[PDB]
C-alpha cells in the first residue's frame, strides 16, 4: 500500500496433527518341561 503493507494476505498453513501413541505387548515362548526319569519305590501304591 502507500505505507508498505500488503493487499493480498499471507498463508497460514495447517500445523501437524497430534499423533496417537502406540505400544505393543510382544510375547515369547518357553516350552514345556521334559518329563523326568521314573524311579521305582519300595512302598505300595497307597503309601507313595
Amino acid at each position: 500500500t502507500i505505507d508498505g503493507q500488503p493487499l493480498s494476505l499471507s498463508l497460514y498453513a495447517t500445523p501437524a496433527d497430534p499423533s496417537m501413541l502406540l505400544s505393543a505387548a510382544i510375547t515369547a515362548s518357553q516350552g514345556g518341561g521334559d518329563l523326568p526319569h521314573a524311579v521305582m519305590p519300595m512302598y505300595r501304591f497307597p503309601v507313595i
Binding site: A25, I26, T27, A28
Partner: protein, 49 residues
C-alpha cells in the same frame, strides 16, 4: 564371565582386586538392568539381539 564370578562369590576370603572385579561385574549387571528397563525390552526383543 558369570563363571569365575561364582567362584569370587561364596568365598568371604577374597583379595581387594578380586572383590574389585566382583563389584565391576555387579555394576555392569546394574548398567544392563537399567539399559533394559529404561527403553523397555520384553525379551523376545532382547534375546534376538
Amino acid at each position: 564371565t558369570f563363571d569365575d564370578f561364582m567362584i569370587i562369590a561364596a568365598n568371604r576370603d577374597r583379595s581387594e582386586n578380586e572383590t574389585s572385579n566382583m563389584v565391576a561385574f555387579c555394576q555392569v549387571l546394574g548398567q544392563l538392568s537399567l539399559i533394559v528397563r529404561n527403553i523397555g525390552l520384553s525379551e523376545n526383543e532382547l534375546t534376538l539381539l
